[model samples]
Target: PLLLYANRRDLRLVDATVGGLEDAAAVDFVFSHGLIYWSDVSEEAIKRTEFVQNVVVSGLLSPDGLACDWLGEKLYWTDSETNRIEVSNLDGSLRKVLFWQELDQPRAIALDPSSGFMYWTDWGEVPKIERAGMDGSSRFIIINSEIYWPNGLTLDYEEQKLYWADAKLNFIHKSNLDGTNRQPFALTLFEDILYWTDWSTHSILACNKYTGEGLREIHSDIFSPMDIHAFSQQRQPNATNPCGIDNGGCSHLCLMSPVKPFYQCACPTGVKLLENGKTCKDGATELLLLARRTDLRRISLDTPDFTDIVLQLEDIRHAIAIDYDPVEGYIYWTDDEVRAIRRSFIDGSGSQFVVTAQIAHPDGIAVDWVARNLYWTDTGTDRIEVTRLNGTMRKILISEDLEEPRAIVLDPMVGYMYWTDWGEIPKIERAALDGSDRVVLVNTSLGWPNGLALDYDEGKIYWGDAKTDKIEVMNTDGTGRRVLVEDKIPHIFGFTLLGDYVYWTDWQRRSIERVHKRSAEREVIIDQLPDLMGLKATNVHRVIGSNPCAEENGGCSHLCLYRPQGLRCACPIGFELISDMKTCIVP
Candidate 1:
C-alpha cells in the first residue's frame, strides 16, 4: 500500500489514494512492505506506522526530509532544526549524525546505495545542492550558487546526474555529481522520471527524465503549487524483465543480460535454437549421411524436408569412418589421406583434428560421450587406440594380434567396443572400452567385413561386407547369424541400423541403400551420393516415448521425429514451442 502525508487539518495520515490528515507538516515519507516511515517538522519527530494493523511508533527528534536506504536497511534524513544530516536503524535505534555543522536549512534529500552517496537541497540564504559519502565525510557542495530556495533533490543513479528543485525560482536544474553542465528545467526525478508541479501556469506535468520532453500533464487542476518532493512505490525498469513475466519470453533458459530491463533465452547445452525466438531445435532428429568421395550431409527427419552439408571436403583424404554422439552433439570421423582423427559440431563448426601427429590411417572412430572418451582404429599402425575427445591420454587398446581393423562400433550400455577387421581372416571382435577382456564375436567365414553396428535393444550385431557384396546380422554373442541382404552389389562402405531398417552406402551404386532386416526387402533411399562412407541413421533409441509425441514427446509439444542419433520434437508451421519447451505457441 502507498502512504502519503498531507494537511487536511491535523497531522494527517492518509492512504496515498484516500483521504489525508489536516496537521500534516511532514516534508517527505517512505513506505516499504506494510510499514510507513515519515519525518515531521511540526511534531519534531520521526515515526513509523504499520498500516496493515494501524500500529504506530512515534518518538524521535528534529525529523525533516526523509530517505530510506532499503538496500542498506537504514533511514537517512535532513534536519533543518539540528542543521545536520542524520541516520538511524529502521527500527528507530542507533541514531547518529552523518553530517554535522553544515549551517543551512537542509530540506530535501536522496540516497543511492549502489554508489554510497547521499544528496540534499538547502533552502537557506546561500541556497545550494550538496552530496557526500555515506558517512558524510567527503562533503562537497555540488551547486553552491545555482539558484535560490532549492527544495527537492534526487539522483539519477545510472546517468550520474543530480536533480534539484528551486521553489523560490519556480524552476528545476540538474548537474553532474561534481557539479557541471547544469541544464535549467522544471523537473524533479522521482523513480527516475521528471515530475513537475507547475505553479506559474499551475500545469502539473511530467516529462522524460533526461530530455525534458514528452510533456504529459499528470494533473491540471492546480492554479498554484510549491514543489514535487515525491517518491514512488511502483517498480523501476531496472528489474529483470520478461523473466519477470515468464522467463523473459524465452522457450527454456531465461538468462539476465548485462543491461537492465533485458534478458536472453538459451537452449540447454548441445541444443541449438529453432527459427522462432522461443523453442530450441530438437536434438534427436538429424539424419547424418555420408559416402566415399562425398561431402558429409545432415538431414532433418523431423522436418523430413531438406538436407545440408555438414562438412565439405572436395579432394584428398575423404572421411573414412564416422559416428555421432547425440549426447555431446558432436560428430567424429577419420581421414585416410590426412591420417588424423577429427571431430566437429553438428553444424560442422569448430572442426579440428583431435589427433594429428603419430597417427597413421586413423579409420573407424566412435565416442563414449558419457565418459568424454573416443575410440578409433588405426590400419597403418595396426592398433585400436582410445583418448579423450580433445585427444590427450592416447592408449593403444589392441596392438598385438590385430590387422586392418576398419569399421568400429560400441555398445555404450555394455561398455564394449566392436570392430570389423578385413585382414587375412576377416572377422568382428569386441572388447571393453578400457581395453579389457578382448574376444572375437564373429569369426566364421566373414568376407571383408568393413562396416559394423550394434543394435543393443535388439541384441544384434549388423555389418556390411564389401568383398562379399552383402549385409548381415547376428546375435551379439556370435549366434543366430543371418543374411539380411544378399545381392550382386558392388562395394558397401558404412552402414547404420535403425528400428526395422538397415541403411548402408554403396560406392559402386553411388547411392544410399536401405533394406528391412526381417523381410529382406531392399530399396535405395538416396541416390547421387558419391563414394559414400560412414553413413548413419542416427541414435533415435536414446529418447523417451515409443512415438515421441505419445509417450513424453521428447518434451516437445507438437510432433516427435527420429534423428539418426536420437529423437526430436517438432512443431507445425507458424507456431513454436515456448521456453517452457513443452507447448507450442504462435511466435
Candidate 2:
C-alpha cells in the first residue's frame, strides 16, 4: 500500500506511505525482505535500505535505472555513463556485466522474474527498447522506432504487459510484452490503471492502462521525477522461497535463481565458493597464493570458479617471491621494486615490513617453520640472508659464491636448504641450515634455474629452468637427475609442489599449468595471467615436524624464536630483551 518515486531534483526517494524515506536517483524494492535498493548519482553507488542503509555497489557512473527480480532474489541495473547493464545478488555480490556491447546509454530497466526475462530502454544514438532473458540470452530489439529518450520502464507482472515513458516524445507507450500491438499509453501498473510522471509538466498522472483513457493528474508541483514503482504484496504473485530450508544448505550467502537448481550459494568478497557450490573456503584453508603485477589473490586448486584478492596493497611492486609460515599463520613475500620484504596474516591482516633495510632484488623467499626464521635470496645484492620473523638478528648466510640467486626452498626437517642461481654459473646448490656443507648439487646442463620447490615427503627437489625450458627433478644429493617437462615451458617463474601435481607459472604462456608427477599428464589450471610472478600452494599441514614454542608460547612474554640449536625468546620492535632472555620489557 505504498508508492515510491525517485525525486531527482531533491536527490531523495519519496515514499507515499512515509514521505522522504532515503536518498536516491533510482529505486526498487523486494516484497519478501522489504528491502529497498536504489542508486545515488552523487555517490556513484547502488545502495540498500530498510534492514539498514548501506552501499551494495560502488564506483559506478550515472546509474540511472534499477529493478529487483524478487522471485530470483537478484538486482539488475543500468549505467548510462558506462553504457552497460549489470546484475548481482541482492547483497551486491557475484556481479556480472550482462550487456555492454550493442548498448548505448541504457537508461531504464524492468524485469519479469517469473518469466525469466528482462526489458530495458536505451536512449543513445540508436534509441530503442530491447528484451532479453533474465540470464542474458536471446536478446533483440522490440521497439526500435517511435522512441526518443525513453526514461522509465515497468512490467505488469500479473497482466504480462510492458509499459514505458518517453521524455523527448512527451508520451507513454504500451505493448503486449513481446512488442506487438504497440500504442501510446505507463511508472507502473496497479490493477487496470497506469501511473506515470511527466517531465515537461512536472506532475504525476494516471490513466486506464488498456484503453489509454480517463487521463488524470494525480499530483503536481513535483520536479524531475525520474522513475516510479508501486509497492504491494499483490504486485507479484506469491511463490515459495527456495532459500527457506536451512538456508538452502549454504555456508554463506544463499540466493534464489530463476533457472535450474533454483538456488545458488555464494561467498563473501575474500572467500571461495567450493565445488559443491554450498561450502566456502578462505586463506586459512588449503589454497594457492598468486602474485601478479598489480594484485595478489588466493585461488582454489580444485576449480578456477573461485578467486579472491589476498590483499589490497598498492605498494607491492614486483613481488616475485612468496612463501608462508604455518606456525605464525603469515604469508611472506619479497618486493624487488621497493627493495623490501613484507608479511601479512594469510587473511590479509596485520601487514608489516619484515625486512626493509639493506635488501635488493629479493626474488626467492622461504620460511623455516621448524626453526621459526625467514630466509630469502637477493639477486641484486648477489647474497642470501636470514633473520627472525620480526626482522631481527639479521645475518648473511651466503654472500661470497652467489650470483643471481633466484629461487630458494627449505627442508628444515632434514636440516637442509636448497637454492637456484640463474646467473653466469647457473646451478642448483644445497647447504646445511647454518650455511655449512655448501656444495653445487647440479652445475652441468643448467641454465637460468629459476623456480625451486622441495618435496619433503619424497626426498626430492624440483626446479624449472627458463633458459633450458625444462622442469627437472633430482634426488636430495642430485643423484637421480631427470627432466619431467621440456615442451611448452617458456619462462617458468614461480613453482610449487601440491599433492600429486607440480604447478608452475609460465610468463610466456601467461598461465598456471600442472602436470601429474607420475603420469606426466598436463592441464592448464588458469590462464591469461599477465605479469605473473610467483605462486605457492600451501596449507596448515604442508610442513610437518615439531614446534618448540607450541606449549604456552615457550614461556616468552612477547615472542619465542626457534633456531637449529634450540629455542630463544625475542621481542618485537619498541620492546627490550630482558635479562632472563624469555621476557621483554618496555624501553
RMSD of each: 26.3, 7.8
Candidate 1 has an lDDT of 0.60
Each model's backbone clash number: 28, 1
Q: To one decimal, what is the Cα RMSD in angstroms of model 1 from the true structure?
A: 26.3
Q: Per-model C-alpha lDDT, please?
A: 0.60, 0.73
Off by over 4 Å in 1: 1-284, 291-294, 303-317, 488-492, 507-509, 540-587
lDDT of 2: 0.73
- Model 1: what TM-score? 0.44
- lDDT (Cα, tens digit) per residue for candidate 2, span 142-209: 88877788867777777767778777877777775455553421377778877787756677777887
| Model 2 alpha-carbon drift over 4 Å, by segment | 1-156, 159-251, 257-284, 304-310, 487-492, 540-543, 547-587
C-alpha positional error of residue 577 in candidate 1 after TM-score superposition, expressed in Å: 51
- Candidate 2, which ten residues in sequence have the lowest lDDT sum? 10-19
Query: What is the Cα-based lDDT of residue 87 in candidate 1?
Result: 67
